[PDB]
C-alpha cells in the first residue's frame, strides 16, 4: 500500500519479521560515537538479515562508524558496492565550512544482498549536492535516487523521524506519532504478533 506508513517503536525490540521483505533498506543509526544511541553490540544484533532476500542497503555513517558501519554491513550479510557522499552547501551552493580537516560531506554506504534483478543501476551518480536543512536531517535527494533505482517497490527506513515518511516506505523510529499501517499483509501480521498493540521486548 503506496502511501506512507510508520511504526513508533524501539527498533531494538520490534519484531521486524512481521514487516515482510523489502527492495531497499535505509538506516541512519544513532551510532555510539538528545536521542537514544545504540551500543556497538546492539547495532550488530539488529535483525537486518530478515528484511531482505535480494536488494540494496543504504547505511549512513560518520566518524568511526565509517568502520563500524562496514562491519555491520558485512555481519548482516551485505557486500559494500558503492559509497554516496553528500556535499553540504548553503542556499548559494557554497560548501559549508575529525580534528584534522573540516568536514564538507557525509557518507552513505551502499550494500548489496543476494542478486537483485530489475533495478536501474547507473541512472544517478554517487555525489549529492544539496543544502543542509535541519540538524542530522539527511537530504531528500536520497529518496528520489532510490526511487529511480527501484521504482514502485517496498522500502523500509530505520531510525527515521516524522519528516522522513515517504510513499512506498515504512518508517521506523521512536519519535514517530503512533502506528500507521495500511498494507493489509503487514496489518494482519502486526495484529497477530501484537494483539494488544504494544511492543515490549
Amino acid at each position: 500500500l503506496f502511501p506512507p506508513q510508520w511504526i513508533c517503536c524501539d527498533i531494538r525490540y520490534l519484531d521486524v519479521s512481521i514487516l515482510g521483505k523489502f527492495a531497499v533498506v535505509m538506516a541512519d543509526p544513532p551510532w555510539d560515537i538528545p536521542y537514544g544511541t545504540l551500543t556497538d553490540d546492539e547495532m550488530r544484533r539488529l535483525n537486518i538479515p530478515v528484511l531482505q532476500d535480494d536488494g540494496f542497503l543504504f547505511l549512513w555513517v560518520t566518524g568511526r562508524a565509517m568502520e563500524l558501519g562496514r562491519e555491520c554491513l558485512n555481519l548482516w550479510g551485505y557486500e559494500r558496492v558503492d559509497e554516496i557522499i553528500w556535499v553540504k552547501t548553503n542556499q548559494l551552493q557554497r560548501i559549508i565550512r575529525g580534528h584534522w580537516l573540516n568536514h564538507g560531506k557525509e557518507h552513505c554506504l551502499v550494500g548489496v544482498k543476494g542478486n537483485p534483478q530489475g533495478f536501474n543501476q547507473g541512472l544517478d551518480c554517487d555525489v549529492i549536492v544539496a543544502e543542509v536543512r535541519s540538524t542530522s536531517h539527511k537530504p531528500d535527494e536520497i529518496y528520489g535516487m532510490i526511487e529511480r533505482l527501484s521504482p514502485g517497490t517496498r522500502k523500509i527506513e530505520l531510525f527515521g523521524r516524522p519528516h522522513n515518511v515517504q510513499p512506498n516506505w515504512i518508517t521506523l523510529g521512536n519519535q514517530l506519532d503512533g502506528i500507521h499501517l495500511l498494507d493489509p499483509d503487514v496489518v494482519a501480521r502486526f495484529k497477530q504478533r501484537y494483539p494488544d498493540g504494544i511492543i515490549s521486548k
Binding site: 540494496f56 557486500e79 548489496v112 551518480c125 554517487d126
Partner: peptide, 8 residues
C-alpha cells in the same frame, strides 16, 4: 557491482 555512476 556498481549501483551508481562513480564520479569520485
Amino acid at each position: 557491482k556498481a549501483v551508481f555512476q562513480r564520479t569520485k
